[PDB]
Amino acid sequence: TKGTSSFGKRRNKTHTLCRRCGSKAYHLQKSTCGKCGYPAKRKRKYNWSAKAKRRNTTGTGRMRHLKIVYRRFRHGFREGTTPKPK
Amino acid sequence: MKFNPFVTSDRSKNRKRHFNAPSHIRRKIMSSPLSKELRQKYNVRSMPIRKDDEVQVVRGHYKGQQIGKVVQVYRKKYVIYIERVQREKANGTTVHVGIHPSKVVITRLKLDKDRKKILERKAKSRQVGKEKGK
């Protein structure tokens, strides 16, 4: 029966964690993430969902490299030099 | 009034800088005036508060001429703790009462190499200022 009886039979997972983007949208049977499209080189992203775009845009994560790039830009990306020793 | 276009007069911004100030500029914020004798001995008016210098409270409940030595500079609460400025709580112990450094005057300076250097620098800039405005 379509209601409570059929709810007991759901025990096989369709989706799983995705090694890219870490979301539980990795369709096991299709081997494709429904949020990022992992086997594709390009990230899945659509302009009809601005709310979804800002959930996973740049700046919502850590920006381990970009925050150092912003710091280094203020001094012209200098390398090979040190402050004058005391 | 203020003419620098890169300095803000916004109240919300100014309070944000004050309450989120790093510790190394909280030291400058927590400055106290020197006594009249000290302002005569060195050509400086104020000085950042120090752990071991002696001050007297001029405002509040603990007003008086008692020269109490500072025992703590608690920069997070923007207060300092003084020797005899303390209160007896319920259980029987005594605890220090935080006092803002702007409400005390430093009677004796805890002097060392760094304090002398800052005192000379402040006095020199003041003498440059008076010789410009003369």
Binding site: T16, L17, K24 | K76, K77
Partner: protein, 50 residues
């Protein structure tokens, strides 16, 4: 189930370590504003994502 992968077990390990009360000394910190762990999870009440 008893049969599990290493990635799933590592995921459950983090959730186990994360599901614990806040320390008592946190309440005494300056400007705490934290009363209790708002992210506490019970196995029967709220199920994990996976």
């Amino acid at each position: 189930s008893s049969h599990k992968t290493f990635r799933i077990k590592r995921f459950l390990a983090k959730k186990q370590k994360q599901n614990r009360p806040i320390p008592q000394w946190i309440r005494m910190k300056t400007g705490n504003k934290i009363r209790y762990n708002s992210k506490r999870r019970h196995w029967r009440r709220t199920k994990l994502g996976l």
